[PDB]
Amino acid sequence: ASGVDDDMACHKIPVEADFLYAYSTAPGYYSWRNSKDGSWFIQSLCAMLKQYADKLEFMHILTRVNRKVATEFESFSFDATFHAKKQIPCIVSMLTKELYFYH
Amino acid sequence: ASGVDDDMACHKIPVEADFLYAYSTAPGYYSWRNSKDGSWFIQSLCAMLKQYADKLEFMHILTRVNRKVATEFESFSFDATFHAKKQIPCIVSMLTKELYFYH
Amino acid sequence: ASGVDDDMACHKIPVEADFLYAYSTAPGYYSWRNSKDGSWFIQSLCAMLKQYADKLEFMHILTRVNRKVATEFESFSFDATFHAKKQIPCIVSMLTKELYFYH
Amino acid sequence: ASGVDDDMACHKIPVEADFLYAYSTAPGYYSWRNSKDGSWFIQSLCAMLKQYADKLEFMHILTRVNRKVATEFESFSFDATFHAKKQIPCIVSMLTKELYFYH
Amino acid sequence: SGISLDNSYKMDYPEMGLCIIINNKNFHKSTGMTSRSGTDVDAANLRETFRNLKYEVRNKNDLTREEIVELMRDVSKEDHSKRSSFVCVLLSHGEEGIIFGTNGPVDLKKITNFFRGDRCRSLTGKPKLFIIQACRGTELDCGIETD
Amino acid sequence: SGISLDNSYKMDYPEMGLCIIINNKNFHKSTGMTSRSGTDVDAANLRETFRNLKYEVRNKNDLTREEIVELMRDVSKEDHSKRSSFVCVLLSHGEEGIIFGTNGPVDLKKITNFFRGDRCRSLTGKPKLFIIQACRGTELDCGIETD
Amino acid sequence: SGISLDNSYKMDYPEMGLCIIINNKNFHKSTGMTSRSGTDVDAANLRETFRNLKYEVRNKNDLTREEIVELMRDVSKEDHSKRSSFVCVLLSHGEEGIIFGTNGPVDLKKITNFFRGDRCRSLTGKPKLFIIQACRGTELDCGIETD
Amino acid sequence: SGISLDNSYKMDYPEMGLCIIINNKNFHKSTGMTSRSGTDVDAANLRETFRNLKYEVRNKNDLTREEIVELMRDVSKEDHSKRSSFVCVLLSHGEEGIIFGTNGPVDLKKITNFFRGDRCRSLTGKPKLFIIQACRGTELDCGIETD
């Protein structure tokens, strides 16, 4: 097969390629922070990196972070409006390869 | 340790949990479609599923899709404005576990 | 009386002052155009200027335009979705004085 | 002349017609309030209504409010970022007739 | 009779109409929103100003997003047949298209829809005025010197 | 029994689940939207691909915004107890957060809400996948040469 | 002399000012945008209307996003000292805050910034009018019968 | 040599790369933004975590919007040839697509553009990670009980 948009002589990559955004919460939602222990997201991210950075690919580490935040945390507030709420981190990957912190 | 927002007696999960959005392009960008072969994203997604669904976890399959679209495709248009453009799919995961289509 | 934010020695005006935007439709809405006679808004604007430019202040002319478009026009479309619809122009004034085209 | 979108047998008006929004500031901008005297906009609106409600059409009253706020007020803040700033109210009219508070 | 133009709203009904003032000064700690010092001065000024225009002024202070919606819904369901117009003044924190209750945001569209021409028939054809003191974004106007 | 980890979704239910494909190629002239040539190739490719993964594939072509919502609502009300997951593929014109029916836009949130953990109990705890081929804005990526 | 009020703009300068009309009817196939039949009628009507108001009317047809910006920049750099005001009419496809060139969108803010009080000194204190015929969203007004 | 796949980024460069942590805890009174208690715990945790991954961690506290941009610009202009990747952690108040400096907002896009494949050549082809702890809106997730 052949076409007008593939196999260019000069190899190029998108200027937006190879970026990964690890957001603490889903689009359009508040993000939670404990005034004493820190944010649910960063707490969880550091814990998962400390435990899996020399064992798992980054996306899989971040997936563990998603689960930890989603299952272990729930807000506490004297304001009923902000009480008993949940959070799910949001992994946005425009990476083109797997990423391992070790080699 | 103990706190006001963890280890609830009644187990609950976010109503937004367990959703995965496989977007064809990055937020705020156009998405490309070949008038004859179909969209770059769907073409690539089907090819990667056909080849890796019985071998890789879903996020890793989608990562291959990201790379395939990012590297192998470039737009062709008689309108200079829309010519020679690129695309990077966008994986948005609020899943709480790994997903394998096989068992 | 006296205060910290009034009667400045050096007189200045907002850089956004003295602008007027005469929009054909309300924020967030489609704008209508007749494929033969032109847009409802421009048709009406020209008619009101031709009739009142040497008699009324601009905001009052535009108000007549609002009424003309709002009352005299209603869409016609073979697509039920776009049929029998209405439109109200939207005057956005950041002008600081009255405007008369004549003197 | 004749057409498909005018002179309907059954007279109707847009459900969005006859609304007027008197915004304190331009779209996308902060609005200013004096912690002691009240907001620049409301202060000015009340002053102009008190002085012109039995003499001018509403849009013209609001135009005076625009000028008063635009010329007489300038922010004062210990934070340089928010100091010496200006404001222009924003009249959004979808009214279909002139409005006089008196008769 | 003589020539009739109808260029101005009929404002000689038995009542000028309601003037609902929602004055939000104190917000729930949970929102992290600061108090709006000076807003009471605005509310009082408005009450006096519209009182002199013969409007039936009703003030409400520190309403939650739920109370705001309930208030607007209730008011829109009243019989406005003998009223010339309707006025609503919103004093609170806000962003483009949003006004804040003491416990969260309320879409301005949700508030105004109650008064749509097809939803509040006793106000159809009558002016519905919404006066809004609130932020519409985070841009700052540096202004320009005048000559 | 031995150590149980539960790190992967249970995908051994009697059924893998539904794979709803909404393929919008032709749009009402009234919208001014152009046809999406090549989308049928995508729909067919998807049908075959998911068929081989043992999904119950259901295709729908050229649905209006009303039909899209009705379809999603109906599907969300089915008993998914014996299904491992749910898949929905949307092929159409779109913008950020919006997918277009043949006669107008549909908020993606309206479609996905039907499947929320509290609204579709037979899918609670199960993966809900939404694959979307549509524009999310008007930005163009000029790309960059690789070394 | 007698009492001076200054309630109206000085419109007795030697020239009323420019009236720039950007008329986009045909768009590049690459954009997928349809032609705007009837817009030429608007452009002609505007030319005649503003001609009679003594404005210096300049029309431009089918301009790309680059040409629009260049046109606006150039015009804003002219000496408007002897002109009473400035008028710009935009006729094209659009969305909220955006106007479309023949090959893509242009932020309205980018166009208007050239004329800011601090960027176009010869127009400082003078009315700057932007007349815009274009969509500002996808909402449709069903209207309401009047009694 | 044998078969080469290239499925993972080359992470064996002399340096893992920089890990820039912007920790905004205290905001100017002028903004009306509250302090972010607990963020220092996050900053310290991150410093230790990335230190153990062999990243060159650089922390910055309470930066204005200007300092944030200057910091990012400067860092993007460094020679990253011998570095495997780049990491930036943003801890602050925020909204969708925006991160707040101590005196105002900064578009995330402005920060990330400095590192685009065509603007930071020594990072082209290398992973650029942005970790963001900040609000992306005002929606609240009520969650759902699990069975």
PDB file of N, CA and C in Angstrom, chain D residues 3-84:
ATOM      1  N   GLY D   3     -40.918  35.690   2.045  1.00  0.00           N
ATOM      2  CA  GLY D   3     -39.890  34.749   2.446  1.00  0.00           C
ATOM      3  C   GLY D   3     -40.414  33.659   3.358  1.00  0.00           C
ATOM      4  N   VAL D   4     -39.556  32.693   3.658  1.00  0.00           N
ATOM      5  CA  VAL D   4     -39.924  31.561   4.497  1.00  0.00           C
ATOM      6  C   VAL D   4     -39.825  31.804   6.003  1.00  0.00           C
ATOM      7  N   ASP D   5     -39.155  32.879   6.402  1.00  0.00           N
ATOM      8  CA  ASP D   5     -38.949  33.145   7.823  1.00  0.00           C
ATOM      9  C   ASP D   5     -39.539  34.410   8.435  1.00  0.00           C
ATOM     10  N   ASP D   6     -40.537  35.009   7.797  1.00  0.00           N
ATOM     11  CA  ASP D   6     -41.116  36.224   8.354  1.00  0.00           C
ATOM     12  C   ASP D   6     -42.637  36.242   8.301  1.00  0.00           C
ATOM     13  N   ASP D   7     -43.214  37.171   9.055  1.00  0.00           N
ATOM     14  CA  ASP D   7     -44.655  37.362   9.101  1.00  0.00           C
ATOM     15  C   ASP D   7     -45.435  36.079   9.394  1.00  0.00           C
ATOM     16  N   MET D   8     -45.152  35.467  10.541  1.00  0.00           N
ATOM     17  CA  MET D   8     -45.832  34.240  10.948  1.00  0.00           C
ATOM     18  C   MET D   8     -47.252  34.562  11.392  1.00  0.00           C
ATOM     19  N   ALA D   9     -48.177  33.641  11.143  1.00  0.00           N
ATOM     20  CA  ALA D   9     -49.567  33.841  11.536  1.00  0.00           C
ATOM     21  C   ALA D   9     -49.654  33.920  13.055  1.00  0.00           C
ATOM     22  N   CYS D  10     -48.991  32.983  13.723  1.00  0.00           N
ATOM     23  CA  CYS D  10     -48.978  32.939  15.179  1.00  0.00           C
ATOM     24  C   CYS D  10     -47.770  33.713  15.699  1.00  0.00           C
ATOM     25  N   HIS D  11     -48.035  34.818  16.385  1.00  0.00           N
ATOM     26  CA  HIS D  11     -46.973  35.658  16.921  1.00  0.00           C
ATOM     27  C   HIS D  11     -46.287  35.036  18.129  1.00  0.00           C
ATOM     28  N   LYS D  12     -44.963  34.965  18.064  1.00  0.00           N
ATOM     29  CA  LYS D  12     -44.168  34.418  19.153  1.00  0.00           C
ATOM     30  C   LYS D  12     -42.971  35.324  19.377  1.00  0.00           C
ATOM     31  N   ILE D  13     -42.355  35.193  20.546  1.00  0.00           N
ATOM     32  CA  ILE D  13     -41.160  35.959  20.874  1.00  0.00           C
ATOM     33  C   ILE D  13     -40.150  34.971  21.435  1.00  0.00           C
ATOM     34  N   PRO D  14     -38.852  35.295  21.345  1.00  0.00           N
ATOM     35  CA  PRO D  14     -37.813  34.403  21.863  1.00  0.00           C
ATOM     36  C   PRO D  14     -38.002  34.240  23.367  1.00  0.00           C
ATOM     37  N   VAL D  15     -37.744  33.046  23.890  1.00  0.00           N
ATOM     38  CA  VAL D  15     -37.893  32.829  25.325  1.00  0.00           C
ATOM     39  C   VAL D  15     -36.795  33.574  26.073  1.00  0.00           C
ATOM     40  N   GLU D  16     -35.758  33.987  25.345  1.00  0.00           N
ATOM     41  CA  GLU D  16     -34.641  34.718  25.943  1.00  0.00           C
ATOM     42  C   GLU D  16     -34.817  36.228  25.805  1.00  0.00           C
ATOM     43  N   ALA D  17     -35.915  36.652  25.190  1.00  0.00           N
ATOM     44  CA  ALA D  17     -36.155  38.077  25.012  1.00  0.00           C
ATOM     45  C   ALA D  17     -36.617  38.748  26.303  1.00  0.00           C
ATOM     46  N   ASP D  18     -36.395  40.059  26.371  1.00  0.00           N
ATOM     47  CA  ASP D  18     -36.784  40.892  27.499  1.00  0.00           C
ATOM     48  C   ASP D  18     -35.980  40.715  28.781  1.00  0.00           C
ATOM     49  N   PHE D  19     -34.722  40.308  28.627  1.00  0.00           N
ATOM     50  CA  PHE D  19     -33.807  40.163  29.755  1.00  0.00           C
ATOM     51  C   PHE D  19     -32.726  41.227  29.600  1.00  0.00           C
ATOM     52  N   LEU D  20     -32.262  41.757  30.724  1.00  0.00           N
ATOM     53  CA  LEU D  20     -31.171  42.717  30.702  1.00  0.00           C
ATOM     54  C   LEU D  20     -30.254  42.323  31.838  1.00  0.00           C
ATOM     55  N   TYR D  21     -28.970  42.179  31.533  1.00  0.00           N
ATOM     56  CA  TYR D  21     -27.995  41.825  32.548  1.00  0.00           C
ATOM     57  C   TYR D  21     -27.068  43.018  32.711  1.00  0.00           C
ATOM     58  N   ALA D  22     -27.045  43.584  33.911  1.00  0.00           N
ATOM     59  CA  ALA D  22     -26.180  44.716  34.193  1.00  0.00           C
ATOM     60  C   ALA D  22     -25.016  44.148  34.983  1.00  0.00           C
ATOM     61  N   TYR D  23     -23.930  43.841  34.277  1.00  0.00           N
ATOM     62  CA  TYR D  23     -22.727  43.282  34.883  1.00  0.00           C
ATOM     63  C   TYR D  23     -21.826  44.392  35.405  1.00  0.00           C
ATOM     64  N   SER D  24     -21.184  44.132  36.538  1.00  0.00           N
ATOM     65  CA  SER D  24     -20.303  45.108  37.162  1.00  0.00           C
ATOM     66  C   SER D  24     -18.986  45.290  36.426  1.00  0.00           C
ATOM     67  N   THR D  25     -18.600  44.291  35.635  1.00  0.00           N
ATOM     68  CA  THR D  25     -17.319  44.343  34.953  1.00  0.00           C
ATOM     69  C   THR D  25     -17.364  43.657  33.587  1.00  0.00           C
ATOM     70  N   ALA D  26     -16.319  43.865  32.795  1.00  0.00           N
ATOM     71  CA  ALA D  26     -16.230  43.276  31.464  1.00  0.00           C
ATOM     72  C   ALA D  26     -16.017  41.765  31.529  1.00  0.00           C
ATOM     73  N   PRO D  27     -16.412  41.042  30.470  1.00  0.00           N
ATOM     74  CA  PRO D  27     -16.228  39.587  30.474  1.00  0.00           C
ATOM     75  C   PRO D  27     -14.766  39.203  30.704  1.00  0.00           C
ATOM     76  N   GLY D  28     -14.542  38.255  31.611  1.00  0.00           N
ATOM     77  CA  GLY D  28     -13.197  37.785  31.891  1.00  0.00           C
ATOM     78  C   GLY D  28     -12.381  38.582  32.892  1.00  0.00           C
ATOM     79  N   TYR D  29     -12.959  39.643  33.453  1.00  0.00           N
ATOM     80  CA  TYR D  29     -12.236  40.476  34.413  1.00  0.00           C
ATOM     81  C   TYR D  29     -12.719  40.387  35.854  1.00  0.00           C
ATOM     82  N   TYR D  30     -11.839  40.761  36.782  1.00  0.00           N
ATOM     83  CA  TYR D  30     -12.197  40.788  38.196  1.00  0.00           C
ATOM     84  C   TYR D  30     -13.159  41.959  38.346  1.00  0.00           C
ATOM     85  N   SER D  31     -13.892  41.982  39.453  1.00  0.00           N
ATOM     86  CA  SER D  31     -14.807  43.070  39.766  1.00  0.00           C
ATOM     87  C   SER D  31     -14.288  43.626  41.091  1.00  0.00           C
ATOM     88  N   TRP D  32     -14.306  44.946  41.246  1.00  0.00           N
ATOM     89  CA  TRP D  32     -13.783  45.564  42.463  1.00  0.00           C
ATOM     90  C   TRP D  32     -14.786  45.992  43.524  1.00  0.00           C
ATOM     91  N   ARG D  33     -14.390  45.807  44.780  1.00  0.00           N
ATOM     92  CA  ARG D  33     -15.227  46.160  45.916  1.00  0.00           C
ATOM     93  C   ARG D  33     -14.414  46.839  47.009  1.00  0.00           C
ATOM     94  N   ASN D  34     -14.916  47.966  47.503  1.00  0.00           N
ATOM     95  CA  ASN D  34     -14.236  48.677  48.581  1.00  0.00           C
ATOM     96  C   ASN D  34     -14.764  48.081  49.878  1.00  0.00           C
ATOM     97  N   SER D  35     -13.854  47.614  50.730  1.00  0.00           N
ATOM     98  CA  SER D  35     -14.235  46.980  51.987  1.00  0.00           C
ATOM     99  C   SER D  35     -15.051  47.860  52.927  1.00  0.00           C
ATOM    100  N   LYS D  36     -15.093  49.159  52.656  1.00  0.00           N
ATOM    101  CA  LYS D  36     -15.833  50.084  53.507  1.00  0.00           C
ATOM    102  C   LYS D  36     -17.048  50.729  52.839  1.00  0.00           C
ATOM    103  N   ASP D  37     -16.890  51.157  51.589  1.00  0.00           N
ATOM    104  CA  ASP D  37     -17.970  51.828  50.868  1.00  0.00           C
ATOM    105  C   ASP D  37     -18.821  50.955  49.951  1.00  0.00           C
ATOM    106  N   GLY D  38     -18.418  49.705  49.756  1.00  0.00           N
ATOM    107  CA  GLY D  38     -19.174  48.819  48.887  1.00  0.00           C
ATOM    108  C   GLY D  38     -18.534  48.711  47.516  1.00  0.00           C
ATOM    109  N   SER D  39     -19.166  47.968  46.611  1.00  0.00           N
ATOM    110  CA  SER D  39     -18.621  47.792  45.268  1.00  0.00           C
ATOM    111  C   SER D  39     -18.718  49.067  44.437  1.00  0.00           C
ATOM    112  N   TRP D  40     -17.741  49.273  43.561  1.00  0.00           N
ATOM    113  CA  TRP D  40     -17.739  50.458  42.718  1.00  0.00           C
ATOM    114  C   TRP D  40     -19.006  50.494  41.877  1.00  0.00           C
ATOM    115  N   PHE D  41     -19.382  49.334  41.349  1.00  0.00           N
ATOM    116  CA  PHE D  41     -20.561  49.226  40.497  1.00  0.00           C
ATOM    117  C   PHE D  41     -21.879  49.554  41.193  1.00  0.00           C
ATOM    118  N   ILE D  42     -22.143  48.909  42.325  1.00  0.00           N
ATOM    119  CA  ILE D  42     -23.390  49.159  43.031  1.00  0.00           C
ATOM    120  C   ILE D  42     -23.448  50.594  43.561  1.00  0.00           C
ATOM    121  N   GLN D  43     -22.324  51.104  44.064  1.00  0.00           N
ATOM    122  CA  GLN D  43     -22.268  52.481  44.560  1.00  0.00           C
ATOM    123  C   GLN D  43     -22.728  53.409  43.441  1.00  0.00           C
ATOM    124  N   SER D  44     -22.118  53.228  42.275  1.00  0.00           N
ATOM    125  CA  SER D  44     -22.412  54.051  41.113  1.00  0.00           C
ATOM    126  C   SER D  44     -23.814  53.846  40.559  1.00  0.00           C
ATOM    127  N   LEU D  45     -24.266  52.598  40.521  1.00  0.00           N
ATOM    128  CA  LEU D  45     -25.602  52.308  40.014  1.00  0.00           C
ATOM    129  C   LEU D  45     -26.655  53.005  40.864  1.00  0.00           C
ATOM    130  N   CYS D  46     -26.554  52.869  42.183  1.00  0.00           N
ATOM    131  CA  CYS D  46     -27.527  53.506  43.061  1.00  0.00           C
ATOM    132  C   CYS D  46     -27.503  55.025  42.919  1.00  0.00           C
ATOM    133  N   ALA D  47     -26.308  55.598  42.812  1.00  0.00           N
ATOM    134  CA  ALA D  47     -26.181  57.042  42.661  1.00  0.00           C
ATOM    135  C   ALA D  47     -26.829  57.521  41.366  1.00  0.00           C
ATOM    136  N   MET D  48     -26.618  56.788  40.277  1.00  0.00           N
ATOM    137  CA  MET D  48     -27.197  57.200  39.004  1.00  0.00           C
ATOM    138  C   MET D  48     -28.711  56.999  38.967  1.00  0.00           C
ATOM    139  N   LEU D  49     -29.207  55.947  39.616  1.00  0.00           N
ATOM    140  CA  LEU D  49     -30.650  55.716  39.652  1.00  0.00           C
ATOM    141  C   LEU D  49     -31.302  56.803  40.504  1.00  0.00           C
ATOM    142  N   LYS D  50     -30.690  57.107  41.639  1.00  0.00           N
ATOM    143  CA  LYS D  50     -31.232  58.130  42.524  1.00  0.00           C
ATOM    144  C   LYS D  50     -31.331  59.472  41.798  1.00  0.00           C
ATOM    145  N   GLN D  51     -30.353  59.753  40.947  1.00  0.00           N
ATOM    146  CA  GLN D  51     -30.322  61.020  40.224  1.00  0.00           C
ATOM    147  C   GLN D  51     -31.051  61.080  38.883  1.00  0.00           C
ATOM    148  N   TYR D  52     -31.147  59.955  38.182  1.00  0.00           N
ATOM    149  CA  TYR D  52     -31.763  59.961  36.860  1.00  0.00           C
ATOM    150  C   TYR D  52     -32.964  59.054  36.583  1.00  0.00           C
ATOM    151  N   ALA D  53     -33.388  58.256  37.557  1.00  0.00           N
ATOM    152  CA  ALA D  53     -34.509  57.345  37.332  1.00  0.00           C
ATOM    153  C   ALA D  53     -35.804  58.020  36.873  1.00  0.00           C
ATOM    154  N   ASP D  54     -36.014  59.273  37.256  1.00  0.00           N
ATOM    155  CA  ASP D  54     -37.231  59.964  36.840  1.00  0.00           C
ATOM    156  C   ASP D  54     -36.947  60.913  35.686  1.00  0.00           C
ATOM    157  N   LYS D  55     -35.825  60.696  34.999  1.00  0.00           N
ATOM    158  CA  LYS D  55     -35.429  61.575  33.901  1.00  0.00           C
ATOM    159  C   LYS D  55     -34.880  60.894  32.648  1.00  0.00           C
ATOM    160  N   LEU D  56     -34.235  59.742  32.804  1.00  0.00           N
ATOM    161  CA  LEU D  56     -33.631  59.069  31.657  1.00  0.00           C
ATOM    162  C   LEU D  56     -34.059  57.625  31.445  1.00  0.00           C
ATOM    163  N   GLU D  57     -33.959  57.171  30.198  1.00  0.00           N
ATOM    164  CA  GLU D  57     -34.282  55.793  29.844  1.00  0.00           C
ATOM    165  C   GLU D  57     -33.195  54.935  30.509  1.00  0.00           C
ATOM    166  N   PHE D  58     -33.542  53.713  30.904  1.00  0.00           N
ATOM    167  CA  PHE D  58     -32.601  52.837  31.613  1.00  0.00           C
ATOM    168  C   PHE D  58     -31.222  52.638  30.985  1.00  0.00           C
ATOM    169  N   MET D  59     -31.165  52.375  29.684  1.00  0.00           N
ATOM    170  CA  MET D  59     -29.872  52.174  29.039  1.00  0.00           C
ATOM    171  C   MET D  59     -28.986  53.408  29.186  1.00  0.00           C
ATOM    172  N   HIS D  60     -29.593  54.590  29.155  1.00  0.00           N
ATOM    173  CA  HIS D  60     -28.828  55.820  29.297  1.00  0.00           C
ATOM    174  C   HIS D  60     -28.367  55.998  30.739  1.00  0.00           C
ATOM    175  N   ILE D  61     -29.158  55.500  31.687  1.00  0.00           N
ATOM    176  CA  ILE D  61     -28.776  55.584  33.090  1.00  0.00           C
ATOM    177  C   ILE D  61     -27.564  54.679  33.277  1.00  0.00           C
ATOM    178  N   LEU D  62     -27.652  53.464  32.742  1.00  0.00           N
ATOM    179  CA  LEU D  62     -26.563  52.505  32.876  1.00  0.00           C
ATOM    180  C   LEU D  62     -25.300  52.994  32.175  1.00  0.00           C
ATOM    181  N   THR D  63     -25.464  53.796  31.128  1.00  0.00           N
ATOM    182  CA  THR D  63     -24.310  54.326  30.416  1.00  0.00           C
ATOM    183  C   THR D  63     -23.588  55.309  31.338  1.00  0.00           C
ATOM    184  N   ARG D  64     -24.355  56.076  32.114  1.00  0.00           N
ATOM    185  CA  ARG D  64     -23.778  57.025  33.068  1.00  0.00           C
ATOM    186  C   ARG D  64     -23.024  56.226  34.127  1.00  0.00           C
ATOM    187  N   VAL D  65     -23.578  55.075  34.504  1.00  0.00           N
ATOM    188  CA  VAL D  65     -22.928  54.215  35.493  1.00  0.00           C
ATOM    189  C   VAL D  65     -21.590  53.738  34.928  1.00  0.00           C
ATOM    190  N   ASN D  66     -21.579  53.354  33.655  1.00  0.00           N
ATOM    191  CA  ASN D  66     -20.340  52.901  33.016  1.00  0.00           C
ATOM    192  C   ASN D  66     -19.269  53.988  33.117  1.00  0.00           C
ATOM    193  N   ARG D  67     -19.646  55.216  32.779  1.00  0.00           N
ATOM    194  CA  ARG D  67     -18.700  56.324  32.814  1.00  0.00           C
ATOM    195  C   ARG D  67     -18.212  56.635  34.218  1.00  0.00           C
ATOM    196  N   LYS D  68     -19.127  56.621  35.181  1.00  0.00           N
ATOM    197  CA  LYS D  68     -18.761  56.913  36.564  1.00  0.00           C
ATOM    198  C   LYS D  68     -17.740  55.902  37.090  1.00  0.00           C
ATOM    199  N   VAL D  69     -17.996  54.622  36.857  1.00  0.00           N
ATOM    200  CA  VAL D  69     -17.083  53.587  37.323  1.00  0.00           C
ATOM    201  C   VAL D  69     -15.745  53.665  36.595  1.00  0.00           C
ATOM    202  N   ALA D  70     -15.803  53.844  35.280  1.00  0.00           N
ATOM    203  CA  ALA D  70     -14.602  53.907  34.456  1.00  0.00           C
ATOM    204  C   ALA D  70     -13.676  55.077  34.761  1.00  0.00           C
ATOM    205  N   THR D  71     -14.250  56.225  35.091  1.00  0.00           N
ATOM    206  CA  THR D  71     -13.444  57.411  35.343  1.00  0.00           C
ATOM    207  C   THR D  71     -13.079  57.724  36.791  1.00  0.00           C
ATOM    208  N   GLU D  72     -14.015  57.511  37.705  1.00  0.00           N
ATOM    209  CA  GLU D  72     -13.792  57.855  39.105  1.00  0.00           C
ATOM    210  C   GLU D  72     -13.102  56.848  40.013  1.00  0.00           C
ATOM    211  N   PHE D  73     -13.032  55.591  39.592  1.00  0.00           N
ATOM    212  CA  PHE D  73     -12.433  54.559  40.427  1.00  0.00           C
ATOM    213  C   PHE D  73     -11.138  53.933  39.927  1.00  0.00           C
ATOM    214  N   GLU D  74     -10.254  53.634  40.870  1.00  0.00           N
ATOM    215  CA  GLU D  74      -8.988  52.980  40.576  1.00  0.00           C
ATOM    216  C   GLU D  74      -8.608  52.240  41.847  1.00  0.00           C
ATOM    217  N   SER D  75      -8.238  50.975  41.705  1.00  0.00           N
ATOM    218  CA  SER D  75      -7.915  50.161  42.871  1.00  0.00           C
ATOM    219  C   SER D  75      -6.689  50.585  43.659  1.00  0.00           C
ATOM    220  N   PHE D  76      -6.709  50.233  44.940  1.00  0.00           N
ATOM    221  CA  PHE D  76      -5.601  50.484  45.846  1.00  0.00           C
ATOM    222  C   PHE D  76      -5.346  49.143  46.515  1.00  0.00           C
ATOM    223  N   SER D  77      -4.112  48.661  46.435  1.00  0.00           N
ATOM    224  CA  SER D  77      -3.769  47.386  47.046  1.00  0.00           C
ATOM    225  C   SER D  77      -2.311  47.370  47.460  1.00  0.00           C
ATOM    226  N   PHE D  78      -2.030  46.713  48.579  1.00  0.00           N
ATOM    227  CA  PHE D  78      -0.662  46.592  49.062  1.00  0.00           C
ATOM    228  C   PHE D  78       0.079  45.613  48.154  1.00  0.00           C
ATOM    229  N   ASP D  79      -0.687  44.825  47.403  1.00  0.00           N
ATOM    230  CA  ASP D  79      -0.119  43.871  46.459  1.00  0.00           C
ATOM    231  C   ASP D  79      -0.040  44.590  45.117  1.00  0.00           C
ATOM    232  N   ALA D  80       1.179  44.845  44.649  1.00  0.00           N
ATOM    233  CA  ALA D  80       1.387  45.547  43.387  1.00  0.00           C
ATOM    234  C   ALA D  80       0.564  44.962  42.243  1.00  0.00           C
ATOM    235  N   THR D  81       0.384  43.645  42.256  1.00  0.00           N
ATOM    236  CA  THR D  81      -0.372  42.957  41.213  1.00  0.00           C
ATOM    237  C   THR D  81      -1.794  43.485  41.061  1.00  0.00           C
ATOM    238  N   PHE D  82      -2.431  43.786  42.189  1.00  0.00           N
ATOM    239  CA  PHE D  82      -3.807  44.267  42.199  1.00  0.00           C
ATOM    240  C   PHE D  82      -3.949  45.765  42.407  1.00  0.00           C
ATOM    241  N   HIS D  83      -2.839  46.488  42.338  1.00  0.00           N
ATOM    242  CA  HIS D  83      -2.874  47.928  42.553  1.00  0.00           C
ATOM    243  C   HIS D  83      -3.021  48.750  41.275  1.00  0.00           C
ATOM    244  N   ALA D  84      -3.703  49.889  41.396  1.00  0.00           N
ATOM    245  CA  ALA D  84      -3.919  50.826  40.294  1.00  0.00           C
ATOM    246  C   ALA D  84      -4.660  50.241  39.102  1.00  0.00           C
TER     247      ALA D  84
END
